């Protein structure tokens, strides 16, 4: 399989791209799809990192911290989108 540094580097770029497009977009449907793209890729890549990474790598550990920061920001944007959906429904 690919190296942990390779997977997390590509995951970082993917999540940054999707989160950027969600913040740029003024369409709630597009925002939900952008956040869904990032959420799915994060779940797959992070859940499989156990298989290829054992720990002890400063770059991989630093990438994990930066990915978690992207993940946390992704969760706020999903909460903001959910807030807007609830407004429409009420």
Residue 18 belongs to domain spanning: 1-90
Question: Is the CB of residue 32 less than 8 Å from the CB of residue 81?
Answer: yes
- Two tokens at 48? 């499989």
- Two tokens at 87? 């407004």
In terms of C-beta density within 10 A (0-12 exposed, 13-18 middle, 19 or more buried), how is residue 6 classed? exposed
Question: Is the CB of residue 10 less than 8 Å from the CB of residue 42?
Answer: no
Helix intervals (H) in the chain: 4-24, 28-47, 49-52, 58-89
User: Which experiment gave this structure?
Assistant: X-ray
- Two tokens at 44? 């797959």
CA distance 81 to 9: 27
Closest Cα to residue 8, out of 79, 50, 67?
A: 67
Q: How many domains does the chain have?
A: 1
């Amino acid at each position: 399989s690919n190296a942990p540094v390779t997977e997390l580097t590509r995951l970082k770029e993917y999540m940054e791209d999707q989160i950027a497009k969600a913040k740029e977009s003024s369409s709630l449907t597009a925002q939900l799809k952008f956040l869904e793209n990032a959420h799915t890729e994060h779940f797959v890549k992070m859940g499989s990192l156990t298989t290829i990474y054992k720990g002890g790598s400063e770059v991989v550990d630093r990438l994990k911290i930066e990915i978690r920061s992207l993940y946390e920001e992704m969760l706020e944007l999903k909460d903001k989108c959910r807030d807007q959906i609830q407004q429409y429904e009420t």
